[PDB]
Amino acid sequence: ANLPTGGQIVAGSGSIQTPSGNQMNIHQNSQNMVANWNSFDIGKGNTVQFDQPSSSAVALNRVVGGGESQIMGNLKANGQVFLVNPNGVLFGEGASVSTSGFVASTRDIKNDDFMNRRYTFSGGQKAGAAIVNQGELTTNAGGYIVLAADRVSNSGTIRTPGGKTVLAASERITLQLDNGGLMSVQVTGDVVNALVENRGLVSARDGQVYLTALGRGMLMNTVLNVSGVVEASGMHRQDGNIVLDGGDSGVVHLSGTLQADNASGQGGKVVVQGKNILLDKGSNITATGGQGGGEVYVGGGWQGKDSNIRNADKVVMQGGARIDVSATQQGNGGTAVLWSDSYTNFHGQIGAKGGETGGNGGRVETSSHGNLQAFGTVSASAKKGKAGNWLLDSADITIVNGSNVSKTETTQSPPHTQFAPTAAGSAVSNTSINNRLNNGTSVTILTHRTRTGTAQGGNITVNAAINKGNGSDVNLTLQAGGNITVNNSITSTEGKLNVNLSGARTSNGSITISNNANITTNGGDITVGTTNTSNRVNISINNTTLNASNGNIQLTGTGTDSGILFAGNNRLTASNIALTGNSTSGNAINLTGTATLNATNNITLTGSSTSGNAINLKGNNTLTASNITLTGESTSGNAINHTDTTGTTTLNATNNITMQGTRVQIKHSNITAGNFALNATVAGSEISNTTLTATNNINLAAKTNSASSGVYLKDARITSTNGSITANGTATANGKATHLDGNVTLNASNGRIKLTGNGHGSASGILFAGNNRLTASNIALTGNSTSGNAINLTGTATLNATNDITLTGSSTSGNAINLTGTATLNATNNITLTGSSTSGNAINLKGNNTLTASNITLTGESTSGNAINLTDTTGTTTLNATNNITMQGTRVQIKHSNITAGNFALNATVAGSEISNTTLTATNNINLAAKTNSASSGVYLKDARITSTNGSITANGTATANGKATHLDGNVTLNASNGRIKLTGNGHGSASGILFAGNNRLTASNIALTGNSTSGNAINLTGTATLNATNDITLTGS
Amino acid sequence: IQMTQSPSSLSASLGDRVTISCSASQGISNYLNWYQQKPDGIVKLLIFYTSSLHSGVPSRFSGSGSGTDYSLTISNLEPEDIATYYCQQYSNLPWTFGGGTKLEIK
Amino acid sequence: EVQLQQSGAELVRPGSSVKLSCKASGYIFTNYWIHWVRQRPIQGLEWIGNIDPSESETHYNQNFKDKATLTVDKSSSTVYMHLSSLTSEDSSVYYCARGTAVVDFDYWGQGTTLTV
Ligand SMILES: *[C@@H]1O[C@H](CO)[C@@H](O)[C@H](O)[C@H]1O
Ligand SMILES: *[C@@H]1O[C@H](CO)[C@@H](O)[C@H](O)[C@H]1O
Ligand SMILES: *[C@@H]1O[C@H](CO)[C@@H](O)[C@H](O)[C@H]1O
Ligand SMILES: *[C@@H]1O[C@H](CO)[C@@H](O)[C@H](O)[C@H]1O
Ligand SMILES: *[C@@H]1O[C@H](CO)[C@@H](O)[C@H](O)[C@H]1O
Ligand SMILES: *[C@@H]1O[C@H](CO)[C@@H](O)[C@H](O)[C@H]1O
Ligand SMILES: *[C@@H]1O[C@H](CO)[C@@H](O)[C@H](O)[C@H]1O
Ligand SMILES: *[C@@H]1O[C@H](CO)[C@@H](O)[C@H](O)[C@H]1O
Ligand SMILES: *[C@@H]1O[C@H](CO)[C@@H](O)[C@H](O)[C@H]1O
Ligand SMILES: *[C@@H]1O[C@H](CO)[C@@H](O)[C@H](O)[C@H]1O
Ligand SMILES: *[C@@H]1O[C@H](CO)[C@@H](O)[C@H](O)[C@H]1O
Ligand SMILES: *[C@@H]1O[C@H](CO)[C@@H](O)[C@H](O)[C@H]1O
Ligand SMILES: *[C@@H]1O[C@H](CO)[C@@H](O)[C@H](O)[C@H]1O
Ligand SMILES: *[C@@H]1O[C@H](CO)[C@@H](O)[C@H](O)[C@H]1O
Ligand SMILES: *[C@@H]1O[C@H](CO)[C@@H](O)[C@H](O)[C@H]1O
Ligand SMILES: *[C@@H]1O[C@H](CO)[C@@H](O)[C@H](O)[C@H]1O
Ligand SMILES: *[C@@H]1O[C@H](CO)[C@@H](O)[C@H](O)[C@H]1O
Ligand SMILES: *[C@@H]1O[C@H](CO)[C@@H](O)[C@H](O)[C@H]1O
Ligand SMILES: *[C@@H]1O[C@H](CO)[C@@H](O)[C@H](O)[C@H]1O
Ligand SMILES: *[C@@H]1O[C@H](CO)[C@@H](O)[C@H](O)[C@H]1O
Ligand SMILES: *[C@@H]1O[C@H](CO)[C@@H](O)[C@H](O)[C@H]1O
Ligand SMILES: *[C@@H]1O[C@H](CO)[C@@H](O)[C@H](O)[C@H]1O
Ligand SMILES: *[C@@H]1O[C@H](CO)[C@@H](O)[C@H](O)[C@H]1O
Ligand SMILES: *[C@@H]1O[C@H](CO)[C@@H](O)[C@H](O)[C@H]1O
Ligand SMILES: *[C@@H]1O[C@H](CO)[C@@H](O)[C@H](O)[C@H]1O
Ligand SMILES: *[C@@H]1O[C@H](CO)[C@@H](O)[C@H](O)[C@H]1O
Ligand SMILES: *[C@@H]1O[C@H](CO)[C@@H](O)[C@H](O)[C@H]1O
Ligand SMILES: *[C@@H]1O[C@H](CO)[C@@H](O)[C@H](O)[C@H]1O
Ligand SMILES: *[C@@H]1O[C@H](CO)[C@@H](O)[C@H](O)[C@H]1O
Ligand SMILES: *[C@@H]1O[C@H](CO)[C@@H](O)[C@H](O)[C@H]1O
Ligand SMILES: *[C@@H]1O[C@H](CO)[C@@H](O)[C@H](O)[C@H]1O
Ligand SMILES: *[C@@H]1O[C@H](CO)[C@@H](O)[C@H](O)[C@H]1O
Ligand SMILES: *[C@@H]1O[C@H](CO)[C@@H](O)[C@H](O)[C@H]1O
Ligand SMILES: *[C@@H]1O[C@H](CO)[C@@H](O)[C@H](O)[C@H]1O
Ligand SMILES: *[C@@H]1O[C@H](CO)[C@@H](O)[C@H](O)[C@H]1O
Ligand SMILES: *[C@@H]1O[C@H](CO)[C@@H](O)[C@H](O)[C@H]1O
Ligand SMILES: *[C@@H]1O[C@H](CO)[C@@H](O)[C@H](O)[C@H]1O
Ligand SMILES: *[C@]1(*)O[C@H](CO)[C@@H](O)[C@H](O)[C@H]1O
DSSP, rough: OOOSSOOOOOSEEEEEEEEOOOOOOOEEEEEEEEEEBOOOOOOOOOOOEEEOSSOOEEEEEEOOSSEEEEESSSESOOOOEEEEEETTTOOOOOOOEEEEEEESSSOOOHHHHHHHHHHHHSSSSTTOEEEOOOSSSEEEEEEEEEEEEEEEEEEEEETTTEEEEEEEESEEEEEEEEEEEEEEEEOOBTTTTTTEEEEEEEEESSSEEEEEEEEEEOOSSSEEEEESSEEOOSSSOOOOOEEEEEETTSSEOSSEEEEEBSSSOOOOOOESSSSSSEEEOOOOEOOOBBBBBOEEEEEESSOOOOOOOOSSSEEOTTOEEEEOOOSSSSOOOOOEEEEEESSEEEEEEEEEOOTTTOOOOOOOEEEEESSSEESSSSEOSSSSSSSOOEEESSEEEEEOOOOOSSOOSSOOTTTTTSSSSSSSSEEEHHHHHHHHTTTEEEEEEEEOOOSSSSOOOOOOOEEBOOOOSSSOOEEEEEBBOOEEESSOOOOOOHHHHEEEOOTTTTTTOEEOSSSSEEEEEOOOOOSOSSSSSSSOOOOEEEEEEEOOSEEEEEEEOOOSEEEEEEESEEEEEEEEEEEEEBBBSEEEEEEOOOOEOOOEEEEEEEEEEEESSSSSOSSOOOOEEEEEEEEEEESSSOOOOOOOOSEEEEEEEEEEEEEEOOOOOSSSSSEEEEEOOOOOOOBBBBEEEEEEEESSSSEEEEEESSSSEEEESSSSSEESSSEEEEEEESSSSSSSSEEEEEEEEEETTTEEEEEEEETTTTTTTEOSSEEEEEEEEEEEEEBBSSSOOOOOOEEEEEEEEEEEEEOOOOBBBSSSSSEEEOEEEESSSEEEEOBBBSSSSEEEOOOOOEEEOEEEEOOHHHHHHHHEOOOOSSSEEEEEEEOOEEEEEEEEEEEEEEEEESSSSEEEEBEEEEESEEEEEESSSOOOOESSSSSSSSEEEESSSEEEESSOOOEEEEEEOOOOOEEEEEEEEEEEEEEEEEEEEEOOOTTTEEEEEEEEEEEEEEEEEEOOOSSOOOOOEEEEEEEEEEEEEEEEEO | OEEESSSSSEEOOOTTOEEEEESSSSTTTTEEEEEOOOOSOOBOSBBBBTOOBBOOTTTEEEEETTTTTEEEEEOOOOTTOOOOOEEEEEEESSOEEOOOOEEOOO | OEEEOOOOOOOOOOTTOOOEEEEESSSGGGGSEEEEEEEOOOEEEEEEEEEEETTTTTEEEEEGTTTTEEEETTTTEEEEEEEEEETTOOOOEEEEEESSSSSSSEEEEEEEEEEE
16 A cells, blocks of 8 residues: 655645545645645555535645656545656556546646636656556546646556647646636647557547647657547537647557547547647548538648648548548538648548438549549549539649559658658549549549749649549549640549539639540530639640530630630530630631530630630541631631631531621632621631531621622632521721622522622622522622622623512712623513612623513612613624513613613603614504703614514603604614604704604604704605504604 | 810801711711701701712801811801801711700801 | 602600601712611710611611511612600610611611600
8 A cells, every 4th residue: 555645734724534444535725736745656556535515626735756657456435636756657557537628737837827727737846756647537527637748658547538638749738627617728849759549449428528738849750649549529629629730740640540430420529739649540530420420630720821830841541541430320521621831641441421312422522732642542432412522733744554653651660760851743543533433432633832942833744544434423623723735535424423523713824634534524514614713724726625515615825826726626515515615826726637526505615815816727627516716806816717628618507507707708618508697897808618508598798897808709609408598797997898709699589689788988789700600599799889789790690580680879079870790680571770879880881681571670869970871882682571661750761772672661851862773663652752951862862773573662852951852863663563653852942842853763553743843844754764553654843 | 976066156157167076976987968957947967978968058068077077167157157067977876966066156 | 969858757655657858869879878876865876776678687786686677679769667665765866877888877867756
């Protein structure tokens, strides 16, 4: 038997008695008292009992002599017991302490502080003194056990249910008590050779465990070592059910098991912080929960951004080490975090599985601010809930094949040498991420550029295939601050693999998918851009196939020299392929090689460049989809240039196409569309060497503000099997509103053609050069201009209308309708040419023109010129009409013409009409009316040979001015053998009536002449006249 | 598209150099007509396009400008000119008109 | 000369409807579109809509989209402006104009008074 000796009460009021050799009793009366002891030793079988007024009653046993306290017996108390021994304290095997609160400390506490309930411990300890616990230390519910020393070891068991267990190794330890319980502990001050080791069991269920070790040196020496069992089961305490701290120095080598489970609710919170933290093979940190997983933190918080947890410098997870935060029955999985600031080597297993009967998967983050070695396995799958996430973040990360990276975990591994990283560049095994996609867990990889001067620019490099042949729908997002260089397939056969190769929100890098890095998603999305963050990211692509199957492919990014560039042979199969690009000097979209963008629903390409081209396709690119839309804007270049001396652009729309841009320069294209439609709004468009076939309506609208022609077609064959072509050109400059050139053929066999050209200023209207073969069931050409021509067909033009042809023009000073070339306007039912002018001519046929139809109706108005003018010293105008012909205007001048008609009718209302050198045949009546108000002739016929097979020639001239009312001159021949000839001439002033000169042969059945003049000759047959009639001849005048 | 006129009214003397500036909400290239409405209610067109005379227009009328600013000038003022000069843009649908500038004599 | 004859003064109670006529002569009726411009009292001019007699194609200002309607009769060379649900606010002088495309409103009608 050995009981403490030298007991002397220094403060407070209490008695010390020894009723037996093995029994020692202390009676406490005051709330606080300090007792100084020469030696505090309890032998085996000896009992030291405290008799205290309450559970909050306070007793202190400060050892002031002897050596290390040797406690082998049982110490029991109804209140709080504090033992201070600078020489250290040892609890042997079988020793038991059971108090309402117990503190063992090697640091002395002043008496004045103690009576004032100020529990602070600092200094006064013997160098190297340790507190070793091999027995059992237990307390009542709400009790606490604290061991603060230079070194603390617990090879026995410690049990503080519902309270706090604190093992600190620091110079100054501050304890805050209230109402007999422990509220907080303040641990500060580094000490030499600090260490707190726990090889036994510590259970603080529904409480907290703090194992803080603040060391002065230990560059690589063990400052904290837990190899036993630490249990803090219960409710998820926000301060953490288990909290470790390695201080600013040392290595926290943990080999035991930490448990913060909750069978009935949410698991506890486990936090492990320090400088260097290594978890051994047997580490079993578990934070599972019945109603949802807890939380685990190794080296810091999420992304290291939690201010309550120190960020570790290096964290190593040896193979076989396990952290489990998965839900057990039903609920969401917890969070497991591995953060370091320099180097993280991870080889262990992390479980963040959701509840089996319900709940989503947890989240796992394995990120290092410097070098990252993630080679272990992670499981955040959910049997019923959504997939979990395995997040990674390093300086720069490169995916590698397999795990044969000469890792140093257990073989040829001296102790704490794993804290010396060797593999520069944050390699990640593709095998790990392969299993992550295979087990229904998302993978997310980020970087972030470090300070300037390092080679860690924040890049991602895929140097290994990434596959997913099993599991439910998963995601995989790679968002770096540098490059997204991909040089390996990312395939998925089973399920969906939604790839998002994003750039960082403030990234200044680019995305390159080359070396035939095919990405198959078996229905998953691919979003290589960001979407709208104005994130400057180039998307270079070379022999990369993007198969989305049933997913949607969206690429976005802005590149000053090249927004999105395509090279080699690319294939992109998806429900919707949406390309969006921007540039400043280069091409916003630049497809150089073969690009086969096979889509089922919609292709959309969008671009905008200040000086370069928005959309610039020069490759052998094929784009087949239901709806393809190319929208671009360019200030100095081209919105949509597809020009290429060798490359051909094939477009196949099952439904319709729409292209928009400032200038749309299409070229060498072969487009099949449902309802094609361009729209250029700045610099017009150009269709050259294309064969654009569309089942239905085509709408080519374009406006040009430059000298370039608005709708410039050259060697284009544009057909509409069932619809109509409607073109709408507008030129505000000295260009042409609509310019047709070269071998152009337009077919609208069941529809219409409407070429509308609105000139401005000196601009001409619609233009025709070369050979233009427009075939349609209805042709309509509309033009409007001021000084140039509203409508002009200088070049050969062929028009075949099953129903009719209509031309309309309005020219202020130029010619409204001008035909200075071989025009062959064949039509079945009707042809009408309407024009109007102020200074120039309304209709001016010059070249060799033939206008075949059943019905021809010309009309025009001119203030000072000639409305209907058909004359050339070489050109011959032929009009072939089965039924009536009508010509109406102010002046009608027909020369060198050869007209055939069923019926015929001129009508001159202002300037009279002139027919000369013509051959006009019309079976039925040839009524010619003309009224002139100037000195020009009313009806002026010369060298004309007019024939009426079955009809009657009728001329009716009125000249209010002094011109000839009806003047016939030269070789005029009139055959009306079956009808009547009636020429009526009304002169005024000094004007004559009917004037006959030259040689006029008027043959008919009945010949009637009528004249009316005031001062002139009513009828004046000056030259040779010859009238042959079979019934009678009538002449009258005044 | 909104049209701007300034000043809303102007007073001057016979034969004085008259200038009616007409600023636009944006660059409308040259889609500008200068209608002159006599006080009775007859509305003509004087300068279609920025500077392009109409038929019944004396040589005194002449415009200029590009982009956002345009002006119509009557070189010699005679009492026929007294009217309100609505400058009209037609670049963008719907077409709009100016606020009118009455040209009063003094 | 090219003339744009309209109807005389038209006065109705608010909430009524009036069909304004624009009769054109001296030019090819199907060679230019007819315009419709309102001069609000002491507030500046405004464009209502146009109809092209060639095909009766119409573009309407959105403000008058439910307020006005245009009809054309090529036989009489006339374009008829229809209105509905008139108020005192719309009481103004309504002009019809001969619009080409590049010449715009080179001739205006005499104008009718619509007091409502
Ligand atoms: C405690 O820490 C030491 C460090 O060397 C290790 O060897 C033991 O295995 C562990 O229990
Ligand atoms: C975690 O616990 C398991 C089983 O309890 C053990 O196999 C691992 O070694 C330890 O890390
Ligand atoms: C993910 O799934 C794979 C199946 O390939 C399994 O091998 C891994 O153990 C698991 O993590
Ligand atoms: C990532 O790779 C790029 C080349 O694309 C290099 O410039 C950066 O230095 C590196 O971080
Ligand atoms: C990844 O692969 C690239 C070639 O694609 C090589 O240059 C790097 O050294 C490697 O890490
Ligand atoms: C990357 O890892 C995968 C595992 O799916 C392997 O197939 C590739 O050979 C390696 O590059
Ligand atoms: C998985 O991917 C989908 C899109 O398919 C995204 O909405 C979810 O946020 C991600 O988990
Ligand atoms: C992307 O790649 C470029 C080289 O073009 C490098 O300079 C940037 O640092 C990285 O983001
Ligand atoms: C993309 O890959 C899927 C895999 O199921 C295949 O069905 C498609 O035909 C291919 O384009
Ligand atoms: C890339 O991924 C991000 C999330 O990191 C998502 O917001 C963007 O929509 C996708 O492009
Ligand atoms: C596409 O592939 C070819 C050869 O197959 C290579 O020359 C190009 O560099 C790459 O883009
Ligand atoms: C994906 O596509 C590339 C060409 O872009 C091809 O080389 C691969 O075989 C395919 O899987
Ligand atoms: C990538 O894009 C940058 C501008 O963002 C351009 O300067 C480079 O030439 C291009 O490769
Ligand atoms: C492509 O986008 C269309 C938009 O209507 C959608 O209906 C399809 O399901 C998608 O693939
Ligand atoms: C970025 O890209 C978008 C998409 O077209 C464009 O609107 C912005 O102008 C350009 O900066
Ligand atoms: C289009 O792409 C090519 C690459 O072949 C580049 O040379 C041109 O500058 C860009 O416009
Ligand atoms: C393509 O986009 C159109 C709208 O532009 C949508 O209506 C279709 O459903 C889609 O395929
Ligand atoms: C597309 O194919 C043509 C001829 O087949 C070749 O000349 C172009 O170079 C290629 O883009
Ligand atoms: C997109 O294409 C579909 C047919 O695939 C059509 O129904 C839509 O109207 C169009 O926008
Ligand atoms: C357009 O694309 C279709 C497929 O829908 C193809 O059959 C036609 O031959 C091509 O014109
Ligand atoms: C494609 O464009 C046409 C043009 O009329 C429209 O009718 C279809 O609805 C759209 O898909
Ligand atoms: C063209 O557009 C029409 C509807 O406007 C659609 O019916 C045809 O299928 C498409 O080719
Ligand atoms: C051109 O595009 C515009 C929209 O900016 C549309 O209003 C016109 O109808 C089309 O010709
Ligand atoms: C269209 O093609 C012709 C001859 O094929 C060439 O002369 C033009 O320059 C191009 O636009
Ligand atoms: C005009 O002639 C050229 C000669 O090749 C032909 O390619 C075009 O199709 C036709 O318009
Ligand atoms: C074609 O475009 C003109 C303006 O250039 C417009 O007035 C017509 O209405 C449209 O058909
Ligand atoms: C245009 O042509 C169609 C049939 O082609 C006819 O029905 C219309 O009367 C004519 O204007
Ligand atoms: C229309 O054509 C004539 C010659 O036929 C020419 O003299 C005019 O200048 C033009 O407008
Ligand atoms: C051709 O023009 C005539 C003139 O009246 C008209 O009646 C027919 O209907 C049209 O085919
Ligand atoms: C009638 O038209 C000819 C050319 O066809 C022109 O030379 C004359 O000046 C005009 O009166
Ligand atoms: C024009 O020709 C057609 C042919 O039938 C006739 O019906 C009209 O009366 C005539 O004007
Ligand atoms: C003149 O016109 C007739 C029918 O009007 C036709 O048969 C002849 O061929 C053409 O010369
Ligand atoms: C042409 O005009 C005549 C009257 O002269 C009429 O009978 C025919 O029907 C029309 O073709
Ligand atoms: C010429 O016009 C007449 C009526 O004047 C008509 O009957 C004949 O059919 C047409 O040839
Ligand atoms: C000639 O034209 C006039 C129009 O002034 C018409 O009234 C007569 O019927 C026609 O012969
Ligand atoms: C002149 O005479 C014709 C008959 O020849 C008559 O139709 C016109 O009305 C009259 O001016
Ligand atoms: C050209 O101008 C005419 C007016 O003569 C108008 O009817 C057409 O709509 C416009 O294209
Ligand atoms: C694959 O890697 C090679 C070598 O670095 C590179 O040349 C290719 O561009 C890339 O796709």
